[PDB]
Amino acid sequence: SPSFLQHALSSSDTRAEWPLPGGLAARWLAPGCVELNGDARGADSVLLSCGVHGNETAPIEVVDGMLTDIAAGQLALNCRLLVMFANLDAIRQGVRYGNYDMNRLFNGAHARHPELPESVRAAELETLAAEFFAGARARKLHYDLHTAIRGSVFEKFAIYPFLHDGRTHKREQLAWLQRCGIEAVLLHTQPANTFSYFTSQYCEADAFTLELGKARPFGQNDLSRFSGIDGALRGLLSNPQANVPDLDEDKLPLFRAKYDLVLNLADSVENFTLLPDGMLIARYQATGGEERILFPNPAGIVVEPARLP
Amino acid sequence: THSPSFLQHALSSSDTRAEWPLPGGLAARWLAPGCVELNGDARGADSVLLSCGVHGNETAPIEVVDGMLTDIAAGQLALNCRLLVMFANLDAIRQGVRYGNYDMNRLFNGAHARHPELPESVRAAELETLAAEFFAGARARKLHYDLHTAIRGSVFEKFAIYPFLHRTHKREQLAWLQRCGIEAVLLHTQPANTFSYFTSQYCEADAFTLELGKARPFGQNDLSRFSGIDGALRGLLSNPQANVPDLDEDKLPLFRAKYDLVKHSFKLNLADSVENFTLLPDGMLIAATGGEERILFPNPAVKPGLRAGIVVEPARLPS
Numbered sequence: 366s367p368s369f370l371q372h373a374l375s376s377s378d379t380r381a382e383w384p385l386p387g388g389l390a391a392r393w394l395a396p397g398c399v400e401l402n403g404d405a406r407g408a409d410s411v412l413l414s415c416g417v418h419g420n421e422t423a424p425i426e427v428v429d430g431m432l433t434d435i436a437a438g439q440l441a442l443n444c445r446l447l448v449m450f451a452n453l454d455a456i457r458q459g460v461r462y463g464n465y466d467m468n469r470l471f472n473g474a475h476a477r478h479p480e481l482p483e484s485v486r487a488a489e490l491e492t493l494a495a496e497f498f499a500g501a502r503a504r505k506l507h508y509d510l511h512t513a514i515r516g517s518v519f520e521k522f523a524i525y526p527f528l529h530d531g532r533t534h535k536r537e538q539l540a541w542l543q544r545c546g547i548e549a550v551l552l553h554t555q556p557a558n559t560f561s562y563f564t565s566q567y568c569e570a571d572a573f574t575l576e577l578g579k580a581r582p583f584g585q586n587d588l589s590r591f592s593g594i595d596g597a598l599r600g601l602l603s604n605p606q607a608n609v610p611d612l613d614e615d616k617l618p619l620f621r622a623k624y625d626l627v628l629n630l631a632d633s634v635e636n637f638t639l640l641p642d643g644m645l646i647a648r649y650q651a652t653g654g655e656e657r658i659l660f661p662n663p664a665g666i667v668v669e670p671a672r673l674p
Numbered sequence: 675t676h677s678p679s680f681l682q683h684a685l686s687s688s689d690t691r692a693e694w695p696l697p698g699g700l701a702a703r704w705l706a707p708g709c710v711e712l713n714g715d716a717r718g719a720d721s722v723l724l725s726c727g728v729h730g731n732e733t734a735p736i737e738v739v740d741g742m743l744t745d746i747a748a749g750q751l752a753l754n755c756r757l758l759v760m761f762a763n764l765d766a767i768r769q770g771v772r773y774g775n776y777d778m779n780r781l782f783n784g785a786h787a788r789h790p791e792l793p794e795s796v797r798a799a800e801l802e803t804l805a806a807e808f809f810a811g812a813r814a815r816k817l818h819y820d821l822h823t824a825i826r827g828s829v830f831e832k833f834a835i836y837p838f839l840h841r842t843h844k845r846e847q848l849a850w851l852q853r854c855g856i857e858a859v860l861l862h863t864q865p866a867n868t869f870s871y872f873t874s875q876y877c878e879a880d881a882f883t884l885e886l887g888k889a890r891p892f893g894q895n896d897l898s899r900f901s902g903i904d905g906a907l908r909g910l911l912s913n914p915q916a917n918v919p920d921l922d923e924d925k926l927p928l929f930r931a932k933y934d935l936v937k938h939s940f941k942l943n944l945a946d947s948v949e950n951f952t953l954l955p956d957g958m959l960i961a962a963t964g965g966e967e968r969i970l971f972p973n974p975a976v977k978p979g980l981r982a983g984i985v986v987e988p989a990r991l992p993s
């Protein structure tokens with residue numbers, strides 16, 4: 366009962382309302398979606414989505430722990446907060462997805478597969494987010510939390526939907542992320558069927574996809590390895606007006622994709638693996654010695670160092 | 675006696691390997707037709723290679739170079755560098771054409787081997803060898819500016835092409851180019867059969883292809899429109915140690931090829947006279963886009979199985 370996740374995976378109720386300390390309340394807007402302090406007229410609005418892939422449980426446990434503390438009065442909440450346990454069936458079964466990768470059904474893509482239960486879910490989550498952010502009068506933030514089976518040179522990294530030449534870009538966000546422990550950021554301006562692109566472009570939110578580490582079943586996550594994100598998120602909800610100690614860009618490498626559709630790499634090759642100059646299939650060929658392979662699967666993208674402009 | 679014009683001597687082939695005295699006890703040595711080395715014995719001095727007329731119809735740079743040589747031989751201009759001047763495609767220059775059989779700037783980097791039956795291939799190989807021997811003797815800086823002009827106009831009147839570098843790109847030279855008139859630089863991401871690529875890679879020198887303006891026949895060039903490159907060149911030969919006023923990369927836009935417009939079977943949605951570096955707005959594309967791409971060297975006439983143009987995108991330096 367005191368467990369938000371437990372309730373979200375069973376849907377004991379459906380639209381009930383849980384009383385919260387300080388006069389607040391937790392309202393279930395839909396299965397696995399709970400809004401807290403939504404009535405906060407002019408406070409910052411934070412969307413925390415997790416479990417888009419059911420096997421990535423570390424962020425799920427982290428988010429559940431925060432919710433518990435808010436209900437126990439151990440953690441203060443001064444933001445409008447909407448938490449979404451995304452793929453409920455996948456989370457309950459402990460798998461990436463049932464019939465289709467949900468982080469490929471967003472941005473409206475679900476319309477191409479209107480029969481899949483995960484598409485229906487993705488459409489419902491898009492609307493909820495859209496309505497949540499439409500009521501925002503201050504900052505609009507969205508962190509879609511992931512973990513991954515495939516290792517990475519930069520264990521923790523973010524994917525940043527860079528849009529409109531960064532006219533609404535916040536370097537403080539890059540600072541906040543670097544403080545969270547993010548070791549690298551992937552900038553992309555082109556459209557994508559991800560939840561962070563959707564909220565970024567459709568809801569005009571500062572949205573980021575965060576790859577926080579290794580995928581593990583529930584009970585096998587070392588939450589200590591997520592202290593950075595856990596501390597930062599708690600601090601955001603507690604006091605969103607806290608200043609951010611700038612960003613020493615010297616330790617926050619930025620990358621961008623130069624060309625996709627990229628086989629000649631081991632099955633367990635790590636994300637961000639540098640490709641040596643003159644390598645067949647980095648026919649696509651490596652050049653310079655600064656390009657890196659990302660999200661490989663024989664189908665992958667070749668990235669390069671980027672700079673803000 | 676001999677012609678006061680180095681260019682005319684080369685065209686009229688008065689001699690072949692004659693040497694002319696230069697003020698200050700220096701000398702000008704004709705190493706081959708249209709190739710003359712001045713102050714070559716200057717040990718420790720910066721070495722400069724100026725090639726022009728690779729395309730015979732691009733005469734503006736030819737007149738500017740020839741004017742400088744006449745001033746040096748007259749004592750009007752001082753020379754403190756090892757200088758090698760090359761009137762590249764002599765036959766094409768004498769005929770006023772881009773080339774006779776094959777584009778010479780497609781025959782360097784060893785590409786001349788593929789067409790040994792062509793005089794332009796023999797000439798290209800000779801120029802490679804001469805340049806190689808010239809730079810091999812260099813003890814200071816090795817600089818090569820291959821001067822060109824063109825029929826098709828450009829958004830960036832004067833621009834440079836930076837050969838593919840296998841050090842990275844030297845910004846000290848980008849600075850000199852900037853404070854010279856160059857308004858943009860294209861950075862090659864793959865090897866090319868150009869003279870500037872050959873010297874940059876084979877002779878490992880700082881080489882650039884310079885598109886200085888509009889192509890025009892002799893006597894129809896507004897040498898005023900070339901004051902920037904002219905003064906910058908005369909200043910280099912006289913006082914090559916003059917520091918360059920840094921390089922504000924925020925004023926010199928750089929570009930690189932994004933992808934080629936492969937043609938097969940076909941319609942080019944741009945005027946036949948579209949200028950190079952014309953910005954492509956977000957929307958129109960080939961059948962990605964962001965209002966940052968520009969068209970370069972469009973040629974829808976080829977329509978074979980090759981490309982009919984190149985789409986370039988902004989390029990940023992590491993620092």
Ligand SMILES: [Zn+2]
Pocket residue numbers: 417418421511512
């Ligand atoms: Zn994931």
Ligand SMILES: [Zn+2]
Pocket residue numbers: 729732822823824
């Ligand atoms: Zn030319």
